[PDB]
Amino acid sequence: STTEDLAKTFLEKFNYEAEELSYQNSLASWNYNTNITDENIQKMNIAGAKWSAFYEEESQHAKTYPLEEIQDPIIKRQLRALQQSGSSVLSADKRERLNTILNAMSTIYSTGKACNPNNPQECLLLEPGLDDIMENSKDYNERLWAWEGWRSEVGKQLRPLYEEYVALKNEMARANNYEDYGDYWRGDYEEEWADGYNYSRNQLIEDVEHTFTQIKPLYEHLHAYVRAKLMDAYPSRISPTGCLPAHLLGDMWGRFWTNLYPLMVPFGQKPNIDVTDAMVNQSWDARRIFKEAEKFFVSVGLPNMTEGFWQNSMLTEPGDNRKVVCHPTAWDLGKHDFRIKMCTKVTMDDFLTAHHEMGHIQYDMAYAAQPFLLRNGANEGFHEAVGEIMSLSAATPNHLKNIGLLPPDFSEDSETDINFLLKQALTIVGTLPFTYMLEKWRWMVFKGEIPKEQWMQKWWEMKRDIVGVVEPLPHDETYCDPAALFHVANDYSFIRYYTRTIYQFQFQEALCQIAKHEGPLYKCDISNSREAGQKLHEMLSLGRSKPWTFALERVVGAKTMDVRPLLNYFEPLFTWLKEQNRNSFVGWNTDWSPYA
Amino acid sequence: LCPFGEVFNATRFASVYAWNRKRISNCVADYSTFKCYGVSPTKLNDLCFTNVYADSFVIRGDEVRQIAPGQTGKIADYNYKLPDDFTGCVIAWNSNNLDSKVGGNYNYLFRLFRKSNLKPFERDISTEIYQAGSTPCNGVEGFNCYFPLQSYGFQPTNGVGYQPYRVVVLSFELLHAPATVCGPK
Ligand SMILES: *[C@@H]1O[C@H](CO)[C@@H](O[C@@H]2O[C@H](CO)[C@@H](O)[C@H](O)[C@H]2NC(C)=O)[C@H](O)[C@H]1NC(C)=O
Ligand SMILES: *[C@@H]1O[C@H](CO[C@@H]2O[C@@H](C)[C@@H](O)[C@@H](O)[C@@H]2O)[C@@H](O)[C@H](O)[C@H]1NC(C)=O
Ligand SMILES: *[C@@H]1O[C@H](CO)[C@@H](O)[C@H](O)[C@H]1NC(C)=O
Ligand SMILES: *[C@@H]1O[C@H](CO)[C@@H](O)[C@H](O)[C@H]1NC(C)=O
Numbered sequence: 001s002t003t004e005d006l007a008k009t010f011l012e013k014f015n016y017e018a019e020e021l022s023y024q025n026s027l028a029s030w031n032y033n034t035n036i037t038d039e040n041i042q043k044m045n046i047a048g049a050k051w052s053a054f055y056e057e058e059s060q061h062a063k064t065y066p067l068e069e070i071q072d073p074i075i076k077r078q079l080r081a082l083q084q085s086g087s088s089v090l091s092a093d094k095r096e097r098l099n100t101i102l103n104a105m106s107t108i109y110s111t112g113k114a115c116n117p118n119n120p121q122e123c124l125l126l127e128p129g130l131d132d133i134m135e136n137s138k139d140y141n142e143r144l145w146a147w148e149g150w151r152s153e154v155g156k157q158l159r160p161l162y163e164e165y166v167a168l169k170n171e172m173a174r175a176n177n178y179e180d181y182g183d184y185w186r187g188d189y190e191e192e193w194a195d196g197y198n199y200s201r202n203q204l205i206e207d208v209e210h211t212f213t214q215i216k217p218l219y220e221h222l223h224a225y226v227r228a229k230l231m232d233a234y235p236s237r238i239s240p241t242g243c244l245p246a247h248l249l250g251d252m253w254g255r256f257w258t259n260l261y262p263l264m265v266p267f268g269q270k271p272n273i274d275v276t277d278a279m280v281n282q283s284w285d286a287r288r289i290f291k292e293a294e295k296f297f298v299s300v301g302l303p304n305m306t307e308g309f310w311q312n313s314m315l316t317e318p319g320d321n322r323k324v325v326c327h328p329t330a331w332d333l334g335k336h337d338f339r340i341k342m343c344t345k346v347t348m349d350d351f352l353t354a355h356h357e358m359g360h361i362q363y364d365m366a367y368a369a370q371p372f373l374l375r376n377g378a379n380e381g382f383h384e385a386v387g388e389i390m391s392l393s394a395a396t397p398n399h400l401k402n403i404g405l406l407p408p409d410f411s412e413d414s415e416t417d418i419n420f421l422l423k424q425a426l427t428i429v430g431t432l433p434f435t436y437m438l439e440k441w442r443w444m445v446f447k448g449e450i451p452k453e454q455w456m457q458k459w460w461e462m463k464r465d466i467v468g469v470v471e472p473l474p475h476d477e478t479y480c481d482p483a484a485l486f487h488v489a490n491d492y493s494f495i496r497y498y499t500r501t502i503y504q505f506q507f508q509e510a511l512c513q514i515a516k517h518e519g520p521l522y523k524c525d526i527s528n529s530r531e532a533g534q535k536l537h538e539m540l541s542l543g544r545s546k547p548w549t550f551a552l553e554r555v556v557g558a559k560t561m562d563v564r565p566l567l568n569y570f571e572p573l574f575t576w577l578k579e580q581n582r583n584s585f586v587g588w589n590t591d592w593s594p595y596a
Numbered sequence: 597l598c599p600f601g602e603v604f605n606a607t608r609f610a611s612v613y614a615w616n617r618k619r620i621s622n623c624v625a626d627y628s629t630f631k632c633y634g635v636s637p638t639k640l641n642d643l644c645f646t647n648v649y650a651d652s653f654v655i656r657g658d659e660v661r662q663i664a665p666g667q668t669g670k671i672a673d674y675n676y677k678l679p680d681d682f683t684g685c686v687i688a689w690n691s692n693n694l695d696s697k698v699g700g701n702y703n704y705l706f707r708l709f710r711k712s713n714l715k716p717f718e719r720d721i722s723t724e725i726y727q728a729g730s731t732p733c734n735g736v737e738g739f740n741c742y743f744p745l746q747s748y749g750f751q752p753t754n755g756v757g758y759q760p761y762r763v764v765v766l767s768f769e770l771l772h773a774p775a776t777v778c779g780p781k
Binding site for chain 1: 708728730742747749753756
């Protein structure tokens with residue numbers, strides 16, 4: 001006569017049931033993006049119809065009668081996720097506008113096109129016309145006309161979802177049976193609970209100054225380091241001593257900052273290495289790379305893979321009318337079905353991606369013993385963020401040292417390190433600064449008390465403060481560019497900074513500390529190490545049984561977030577960068593046109 | 597001098613519910629996984645074989661470890677348990693390509709709930725709706741009142757750990773039943 005076992009079976013039967021639906025949807029999705037036919041263009045709405053019916057009916061079952069007198073917070077949270085749901089209660093006549101501004105973005109983007117100024121009818125899509133100029137040629141007007149064509153015939157058809165949003169939508173979310181929805185779009189981490197510690201999230205955002213006092217005056221030195229070393233980029237139009245240009249920012253929506261750095265060339269001749277030709281010259285072969293990149297992490301006390309994976313992963317490109325996305329995806333087919341598809345082509349991108357894929361397909365079975373409700377690691381942000389650091393570890397001659405022909409003491413000669421392979425410092429953090437007001441835009445327009453003098457005016461003051469962007473023809477506060485973000489209808493995360501951003505902060509306070517080097521990952525041992533196996537392969541499995549803070553702590557030693565991984569690893573060029581220039585003129589100098 | 601191994605090369609394996617028990621006599625034989633307790637399967641000739649109590653079932657690949665006396669598990673609790681007088685072993689092999697069809701096979705069952713303890717080798721055929729609320733359910737699905745059985749869904753695409761296996765269990769009661777080994781004088 002207890003409610004616990006009364007409600008438990010309701011959870012268990014559906015936890016056993018959902019596997020067949022998940023499996024069927026997985027094969028349907030794979031068949032579609034592998035075999036694209038008119039029979040396959042519509043898989044999701046019909047395959048997940050039964051899943052949606054199950055979810056909605058069980059949500060109405062669990063919602064109306066709650067579980068007040070339960071005494072296990074882990075179980076309460078575990079059933080809470082499918083206990084609470086919605087978005088199908090409101091009246092159609094008024095909810096249709098909301099779902100329209102949410103969804104109709106994809107349709108206009110699918111029917112959109114950007115073309116040359118002198119191409120009336122016969123012309124191609126947006127990307128190929130403008131993405132190759134910086135790396136191939138030097139043509140000004142094609143890049144200059146980009147924002148004008150955007151604002152005139154490509155960005156004008158984002159208005160039908162625009163004019164109503166910024167005018168009225170701020171308040172009309174009052175019937176959403178929650179506090180708000182911005183908390184879930186960029187805030188689904190604020191959760192408070194019990195059992196020893198109460199945990200918060202605002203410490204991961206408010207420490208900007210605290211964690212980057214060491215990186216904040218970096219534009220103020222780069223403004224002169226451009227003339228110091230990067231002169232070869234573009235003369236005859238760009239201000240030598242004036243402001244950094246903003247009518248030639250580099251791209252259309254401000255994603256990354258990697259399209260302007262690699263323009264310092266002091267020498268031209270070098271016996272470099274390359275995946276195109278130098279692959280097999282020095283005692284190397286392309287067939288057994290999959291076996292040896294296995295050996296390096298399987299000889300540490302792990303057994304090898306069966307031929308099932310070998311015959312399930314065919315090594316030929318699609319090529320023909322049958323085509324797949326050549327970008328490989330770690331298929332989470334489930335039920336011990338792990339499969340990857342790729343194309344036959346040797347590149348360092350291919351090697352790094354393959355390394356990440358085998359890391360995924362190898363760590364995945366650590367939690368394979370858990371039932372359905374725990375099918376993921378500690379955090380999906382890491383499973384797709386560690387690809388970069390594993391690629392970094394791979395791109396180092398430990399392979400040549402391990403095969404034993406070129407000795408490890410054959411370090412690159414002095415005049416060879418300066419040319420091409422020493423720019424990796426700010427490539428990650430060059431996109432961070434302009435996202436704060438975008439993250440807080442809903443967080444301070446939810447109130448509805450805001451006046452119209454401040455819509456997003458803070459942009460210009462932030463540029464004047466840290467960056468020095470002098471605005472050309474305005475995509476101003478009236479033109480809500482954040483409201484027109486491209487991935488709005490693709491339901492990708494924008495929850496922390498962009499995606500898998502702030503959870504990467506405190507984990508590596510002791511990674512190489514345990515991997516036993518006093519300093520950085522350089523010379524830090526990962527191969528043939530007995531300690532590495534017991535440092536990773538046993539603890540890379542958490543599940544929902546324990547909060548994520550325990551998994552974080554068992555690695556780091558502290559609950560709070562710090563920035564110690566931002567250590568003197570980056571010193572060898574910081575000692576070239578941040579001692580001298582604290583006197584020159586940076587940014588705005590009152591010698592150019594501000595409004596243009 | 598007699599046919600012995602009918603069950604090793606079997607055609608189809610029944611459900612996990614209906615056990616199959618045969619009595620035979622005066623037969624003996626010798627040898628993916630194999631493991632027993634009484635004696636080596638190759639040198640077993642040194643002991644008296646008396647009683648034959650044969651059975652077989654179908655069990656998902658990884659949970660073969662749960663078939664042993666005095667263990668814990670839902671499958672053991674609801675289907676089969678073994679006593680403290682253990683004398684026998686469990687034999688199994690993988691037959692995924694022989695037992696799995698591409699479309700999928702969905703004709704198997706198990707149990708989830710019970711009301712009391714069970715003595716080994718016991719059956720309950722009743723499949724009445726399960727009541728736990730104070731108001732008696734008169735045949736209303738849901739509200740803790742449901743139907744117990746549930747399918748399995750095997751395919752040849754399934755993983756190695758969860759690929760189907762064929763399970764063989766032999767029990768020989770050490771009673772005074774006749775032997776199956778002799779010679780001249
Ligand atoms: C995983 O890697 C290889 C795969 O066979 C194993 O090492 C080889 O094993 C074969 C067969 O036993 C031997 O003939 C080779 O001499 C072995 N090569 C060595 C030891 O360098 C290895 O044992 C496998 N790991 C496990 C746990 O089975
Ligand atoms: C979590 O935060 C609690 C804040 O006060 C509590 O708020 C609600 C939940 C009521 O239960 C109220 O009586 C409580 O005082 C802290 O008290 C609590 O210690 C925090 N959790 C932990 C594990 O310390
Ligand atoms: C795609 O479908 C066609 C016809 O249905 C089939 O012949 C082909 O094998 C399929 N593709 C793959 C990769 O199986
Ligand atoms: C039949 O049983 C024998 C006994 O060892 C075995 O070798 C054989 O593989 C089985 N199957 C067939 C088709 O003979």
